[PDB]
Amino acid sequence: GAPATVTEQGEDITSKKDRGVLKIVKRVGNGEETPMIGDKVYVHYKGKLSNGKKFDSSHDRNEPFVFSLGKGQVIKAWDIGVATMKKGEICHLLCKPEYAYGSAGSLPKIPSNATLFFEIELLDFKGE
Numbered sequence: 020g021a022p023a024t025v026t027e028q029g030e031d032i033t034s035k036k037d038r039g040v041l042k043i044v045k046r047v048g049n050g051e052e053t054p055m056i057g058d059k060v061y062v063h064y065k066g067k068l069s070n071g072k073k074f075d076s077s078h079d080r081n082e083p084f085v086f087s088l089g090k091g092q093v094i095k096a097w098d099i100g101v102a103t104m105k106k107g108e109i110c111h112l113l114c115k116p117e118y119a120y121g122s123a124g125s126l127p128k129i130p131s132n133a134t135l136f137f138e139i140e141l142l143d144f145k146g147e
C-alpha cells in the first residue's frame with residue numbers, strides 16, 4: 020500500500036541524507052515557489068502508524084492545520100517536508116522517529132520509536 024511504496028520508492032529529502040524523511044509527490048502543485056521560513060502554512064493531512072491505525076486527520080475536523088514554517092512548531096519531518104512543497108501539492112512522507120516523536124512518543128496514540136506515514140496537501144502559504 021501507500022506506506023510500503025513511500026518506504027521503498029520515496030526520495031530522501033533530509034540535508035543529512037540519512038533516509039529519515041522520504042517523500043513522493045502525488046499531485047504536482049502550482050508554479051515553482053515553495054514557502055519561506057516563518058510563513059503561515061495551511062495544510063490538510065492524514066497520519067497513520069506502522070500498524071495501520073489512523074492517528075490524526077484534519078479533514079475529519081473540517082479545518083486545516085496552520086503553523087509557522089521552520090520554527091519547530093511541528094515535528095522535524097513536517098518542517099523539512101512542507102518546505103519542499105508547492106501550493107496545491109499533495110505528497111506522502113515516511114518519517115522515522117528521529118524526525119518525529121522519538122523515544123517519547125505522543126499520547127494518546129503515538130508509541131515510542133514510531134515511524135509515521137502522512138499524506139499532506141499544502142493549501143496555502145502567506146508571509147505575515
Ligand SMILES: [Cl-]
Binds near residue numbers: 020021022
Ligand atoms: Cl495504501
Ligand code: NA
Binds near residue numbers: 021024
Ligand atoms: Na503507489
Ligand code: NA
Binds near residue numbers: 044103104105
Ligand atoms: Na515540490
